[PDB]
Design an enzyme around this catalytic site. Sequence first.
Site, short mmCIF file in Angstrom:
data_model
loop_
_atom_site.label_atom_id
_atom_site.label_comp_id
_atom_site.label_asym_id
_atom_site.label_seq_id
_atom_site.Cartn_x
_atom_site.Cartn_y
_atom_site.Cartn_z
CD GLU A 1 20.87 13.98 11.38
OE1 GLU A 1 21.18 12.97 10.78
OE2 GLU A 1 19.73 14.06 12.02
CG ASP B 1 13.67 9.42 13.98
OD1 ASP B 1 12.60 8.89 14.19
OD2 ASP B 1 14.69 8.78 13.51
#
Length: 164
Positions: free
Chosen positions: A11, A20
């Site tokens: 991540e 994202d």
Amino acid sequence: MNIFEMLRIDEGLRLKIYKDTEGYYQIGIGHLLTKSPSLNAAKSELDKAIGRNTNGVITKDEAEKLFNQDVDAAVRGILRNAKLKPVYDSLDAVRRAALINMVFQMGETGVAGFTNSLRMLQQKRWDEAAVNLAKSRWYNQTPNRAKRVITTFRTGTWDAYKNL
Ligand SMILES: [Cl-]
Ligand SMILES: [Cl-]
């Protein structure tokens, strides 16, 4: 290697709000803020999460606190999930980490939909679940990540993460 080290790799770590890969607002270590288009809506969500007036910015310490809370919630979601639980209970320690990872990324609901791969994982048909998992939007949108997780499931080791 552990779940924390594993997801930190996948991540990343970012101290400012950001989009994202699906254009959503996130921050920290994969912490989803909002599926909505407003940077304002995201700053609102963020402050409420942090408990202070952030201004789109948090500390490392803050990001890690969200991280701990999120890993914990993923684990508990799997445990409470009637479709996930039995899978998770049948796997070894490394492969359980690979299941938590998918859950963290896409939610209990999303994972619970991999009905066929789940069945193969439960049956310990490694290579066949690996192929099944690859046939997904998930693998097409974030292939590199998907490949690390999938190899983890296939081999039951941390090979795909060593070096990273
Ligand atoms: Cl939260
Ligand atoms: Cl990727």
